[PDB]
């Protein structure tokens, strides 16, 4: 569970990330695609070339979703209701991908903000991303 100190760490880290969140999300999407090709099956109608604006916008959307989740860390299931229903029944995204994406997102932060990515902040971000993934994948059926 997210302990109150854990919440403070997550809040501070996502405040420090700043407006670069959209770029980081796009980079995370591209990195997940490149590392594990199998995750591209869920984007058949997507221009996945280098510098594509489509994946840029998708990463911006994911980053905005995560920022909204952080703002509502105490009531996360309600914040991600629509996205949970979209990823659970409509798209039927497998749970594994989520963890993959999380790791990718994490590494992106480590690549751009080494100073603030202390081990405690690492634990906090991992717990928060695990909670988000579990909420989005909960109703998988």
């Amino acid at each position: 569970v997210l302990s109150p100190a854990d919440k403070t760490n997550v809040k501070a880290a996502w405040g420090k990330v700043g407006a670069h969140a959209g770029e980081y999300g796009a980079e995370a999407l591209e990195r997940m695609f490149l590392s594990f090709p199998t995750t591209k099956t869920y984007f058949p109608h997507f221009d996945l070339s280098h510098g594509s604006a489509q994946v840029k916008g998708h990463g911006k959307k994911v980053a905005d979703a995560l920022t909204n989740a952080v703002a509502h860390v105490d009531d996360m299931p309600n914040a991600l209701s629509a996205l949970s229903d979209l990823h659970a029944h409509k798209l039927r995204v497998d749970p594994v991908n989520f963890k993959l994406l999380s790791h990718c997102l994490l590494v992106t932060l480590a690549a751009h903000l080494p100073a603030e990515f202390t081990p405690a902040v690492h634990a906090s971000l991992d717990k928060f991303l695990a909670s988000v993934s579990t909420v989005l994948t909960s109703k998988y059926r």
Partner: protein
């Protein structure tokens, strides 16, 4: 009864025989417990997979593949749900042929006395998801302490009085909580059940009789360490229907 070969996340190496693996026709893994030579226990939610709940159990039975021991296949003959499944997710499954009890296939027999006392330490083993949300290749087993019922009700529903309940499950989905359930907290190292371990027995090791007793069947595995409590159905509250169903078949 209750003699495993070896009493003892950590990879099992000869300790949990009663466990059984199930896969639906659309490739989702779930757990089950051996109760006798020919009968099992499972959660009802593991039976309504990839089809509407309006279907009959006859339609469910042939669409589920079942493994026991070391990847030993078995065939399902019948599936019988509890008449009040909407509030208790017990579901029993009958094997095509009675299994030859051996070190890798051996049941877990049921409590003559309740063991869901706060602080009691029990064992839970399952084929569920892991830290990367991939189904475990090798059987996993964890140790959980029983947790207070009132705290669990507050965690998932807020207030004990029915008129004042409102949903507050941290993982979105809400479990079935009533007099037929009990809850358990995380381990010492923050280990908790996740998707696919439903149906696995909450085993308690009684030293006086040196016997393992199945104290509950996990009915909420969506905690995945995000929620703080996992939810189980009490076997003692289900003993009578189990005995009647076994005798009738």
């Amino acid at each position: 009864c209750g003699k495993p070969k070896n009493p003892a996340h950590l990879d099992a190496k000869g300790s949990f025989p009663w466990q059984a693996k199930m896969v639906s026709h659309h490739n989702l893994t779930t757990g089950a417990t051996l109760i006798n030579e020919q009968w099992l226990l499972t959660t009802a939610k593991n039976l309504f997979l990839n089809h509407s709940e309006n279907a009959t159990a006859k339609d469910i039975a042939p669409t589920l593949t079942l493994y026991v021991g070391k990847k030993q296949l078995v065939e399902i003959e019948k599936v019988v749900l509890h008449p009040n499944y909407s509030q208790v997710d017990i579901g029993l499954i009958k094997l095509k042929q009675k299994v030859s009890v051996n070190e890798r296939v051996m049941p877990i027999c049921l409590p003559s006395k309740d063991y869901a006392e706060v602080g009691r330490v029990g064992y839970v083993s399952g084929w569920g998801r892991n830290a990367n949300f991939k189904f475990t290749d090798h059987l996993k087993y964890v140790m959980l302490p029983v947790a207070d019922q009132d705290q669990c009700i507050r965690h998932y529903e807020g207030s004990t009085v029915p008129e004042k309940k409102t949903p507050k499950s941290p993982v979105g989905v809400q479990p079935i909580l009533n007099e037929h359930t009990f809850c358990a907290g995380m381990s010492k190292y923050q280990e908790d059940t996740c998707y696919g371990d439903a149906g696995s027995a909450f085993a308690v090791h009684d030293l006086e009789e040196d016997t393992w007793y199945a104290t509950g069947i996990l009915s909420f595995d969506k905690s995945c360490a995000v929620a703080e409590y996992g939810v189980y159905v009490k076997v003692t509250s289900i003993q009578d229907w189990v005995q009647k169903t076994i005798a009738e078949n």
